[PDB]
C-alpha cells in the first residue's frame, strides 16, 4: 500500500555514486521540477546496477523522469520543533527525450 | 481541468512508427508492454502476470527524438494523459505522452541536448 | 512488479452495476466520465475538452460499499491499476479499482465504518 | 508542469477549518499512509467550498483518498542547516469506500 510519485525535472548536481560496506552501489541525486518560478526539489536515491547506470549516463542539468516511492521521516522537539524529511526511492529513471536524444546501450 | 494522467514502464513491442500530418506535424506512435509481477504460493518465487499493451502516441520534436532514440525492446518510462480515440464502430484508449525516456534500469545512455 | 496505476476523477455515467461470480464473489462495474478543461484564446474563458470514459470494475466488500454509496452522477476519485480485458475479437482497457470514494468537491458525506 | 500525487491513508486529527481575512475557507488536515510499520505523513490543505465539505464530512481516523500537487520549500543555514517543508494542495478528496459506506449529499 506504498505511495508512488512521478517527477520530471533536472538534476541539481552530478549523481553521487558510492558503495556501502555491503558492496552495494548507491546513487544519490536530487530532481528540480520547475514551472515556466519556485521549484519542487526532491532528494532521490537509487540502488544497485541502475545506480551505476545513472552515474555513467546522467549529469548536472540532465532532464529526467523518475517514478518511485515517497519515504518521509519526522523529527525535532528536543532541538527545534516540527521538522520533516522526504525522498524518493526510485524504481525507474530515464533521461527525458522532449528536448534531447539519447544513444541507448545494453549491458 | 485535471487531465487523467498516468505513468507507465515497459518495453516497446516494435520500433517507433513516425508519421506526419499532411502539413508536416510529426506524430510517432508505439505501444508499451508492461508485464506486472507477483509471488506464487506453495512453490514459486516470483512470476509475471498479465501483459498490458498501452497504445501510445506523441507529438512534435519529442516524437522525432523518440524516433532517433528508441527501438523494439526499449525499456521505457512514460508519463502522459489518457485520451479516447475512436474510428471506423468504437473507441480505443490511448496515452498522449507528455514525457518519455529509456529506463536506465538495464541500460546506459548518452543524452544529447537539443536547444 | 510495478503495476501501471492511475488516478481518475469524474462522475458515474450510470448507477453502479453489482454482480456476482457463480460462487458469490461481488463485482461491481461502473464507468467514469472525466471531462478535462482548457482556455479558449480570442474570447473564451475556460471550456471542457474531450470526455474520457474509463470502464471500472471493483471487487469484494468495496464493491458492495460502492453499490450502497454511489449513483449515476456521483463525483468520484478513483485510484487503481490498468488491466486489459478481452472478449468475443479484441481487447478493452479497464481500471481495477484499489480505492474509490465520492469527491467532497460539491458534496458532503456521512461515512459509516465497517470492521 | 506541476507534480501531482495520490495518497491513501487516515487523518491524524479532525480537519481544521478556518477563514482568512479575505473571507476564504481553509481546511488543514494531514494524511497517514500505513503499510500493514513506519508511515508516510503528509500535511494537506484544501480551500474554499470543498474545505467546508471536508470539515463537515471527515473526522479523525477517516480513511481518505487525496490527489493534489506537491509543494516543497527549503530553508535553514543561519540556524540549523538542511531543512525541508512539504505538503499537498488538494484538488480532490473523498472518504474511501474500501472499509466504509457513505451517505452522499448534494449542495
CATH number at residue A26: 2.40.50.140
Pick from B9, B77, B4, B33: nearest CA to A97: B77
d(CA C55, CA D94): 20
Bridge partners (DSSP) of residue B110 are: A103
What does residue D80 show for φ and ψ, rounded to 5 degrees?
60, 130
For residue C106, give its domain range: 1-115
Question: Which chain D residues have a beta carbon less than 8 Å from that of B2?
Answer: 4, 67, 91-92
Cα torsion through C89, B29, D3, D91, rounded to 10: -40
Q: How many CB atoms lie within 10 A of CB D91?
A: 19
Question: Which chain A residues have a beta carbon less than 8 Å from that of D38?
Answer: 73
* Contact assessment for residue D62 and residue C108, using Cβ atoms and an 8 Å cutoff: no
Question: Which chain B residues have a beta carbon less than 8 Å from that of D67?
Answer: 2
Of all residues in chain B, the one with the smallest CA distance to C84 is B52
What does residue C81 show for φ and ψ, rounded to 5 degrees?
-135, 145
d(CA D107, CA D104): 10
Q: In sequence order, which residues have a C-beta less than 8 Å from that of residue C67 and are 6 or more positions away?
A: C16, C18, C26, C28
- State whether A67 and C2 contact (CB < 8 Å): yes
Cell 508492461: give the residue.
B34
Check CB contact of C24 with chain A, cutoff 8 Å: no
Class of residue B37 by CB neighbours under 10 A (exposed 0-12, middle 13-18, buried 19+): exposed
Q: Resolution reached, in Å? A: 2.7
Put simply, the chain B residues between 84 and 113 with a CB less than 8 A from any chain A CB are: 98-113
Cα of first residue to Cα of last residue in chain B, in angstroms, is: 30
Pick from C12, B78, B83: nearest CA to A97: B78
Pick from C30, A2, C99, C98: nearest CA to D65: C99
Cα torsion through B53, B58, B62, B65, rounded to 10: 60
Q: In sequence order, which residues have a C-beta less than 8 Å from that of residue C109 and are 6 or more positions away?
A: C102, D57, D94, D95, D102, D103, D104, D105
d(CA C79, CA A3): 11
For residue C71, the number of C-alpha atoms closer than 13 Å in the C-beta half-sphere is 5
Cell 505538503: give the residue.
D87
Of all residues in chain B, the one with the smallest CA distance to C38 is B1
Q: How many CB atoms lie within 10 A of CB A17?
A: 17
Question: Which chain C residues have a beta carbon less than 8 Å from that of B80?
Answer: none
- State whether A74 and D41 contact (CB < 8 Å): yes
d(CA B36, CA B50): 6
**C79 → closest Cβ in D54, D59, D65:** D65
Instruction: Report how many domains make up chain B.
Output: 1
* Contact assessment for residue B49 and residue B36, using Cβ atoms and an 8 Å cutoff: yes
Q: In sequence order, which residues have a C-beta less than 8 Å from that of residue C41 and are 6 or more positions away?
A: none
Of all residues in chain B, the one with the smallest CA distance to A95 is B101
For residue D62, the number of C-alpha atoms closer than 13 Å in the C-beta half-sphere is 26
Neighbours of chain B (3+ CB pairs under 8 A): A, C, D
Check CB contact of B6 with chain C, cutoff 8 Å: yes
Interface size A-C, in CB pairs within 8 Å, comes to 5
Nine cell digits for residue B114: 537539443
Of all residues in chain A, the one with the smallest CA distance to D3 is A7
**Cβ density class A25-55: b for 16+ within 10 Å, e for less:** bbbbbbbbbeeeeebbbbebbbeeebbbbbb
Check CB contact of C3 with chain D, cutoff 8 Å: no
- The dihedral through the CA atoms of A55, A59, A64, A67 has a sign that is positive
Amino acid at each position: 500500500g506504498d505511495t508512488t510519485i512521478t517527477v520530471v525535472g533536472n538534476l541539481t548536481a552530478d549523481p553521487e555514486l558510492r558503495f556501502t560496506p555491503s558492496g552495494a552501489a548507491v546513487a544519490n541525486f536530487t530532481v528540480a521540477s520547475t514551472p515556466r518560478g519556485e521549484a519542487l526539489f526532491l532528494r532521490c536515491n537509487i540502488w544497485r546496477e541502475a545506480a551505476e547506470n545513472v552515474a555513467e549516463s546522467l549529469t548536472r542539468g540532465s532532464r529526467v523522469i523518475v517514478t518511485g516511492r515517497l519515504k518521509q521521516r519526522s523529527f525535532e522537539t528536543r532541538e527545534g520543533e516540527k521538522r520533516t524529511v522526504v525522498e524518493v526511492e526510485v524504481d525507474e529513471i530515464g533521461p527525458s527525450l522532449r528536448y534531447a536524444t539519447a544513444k541507448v546501450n545494453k549491458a
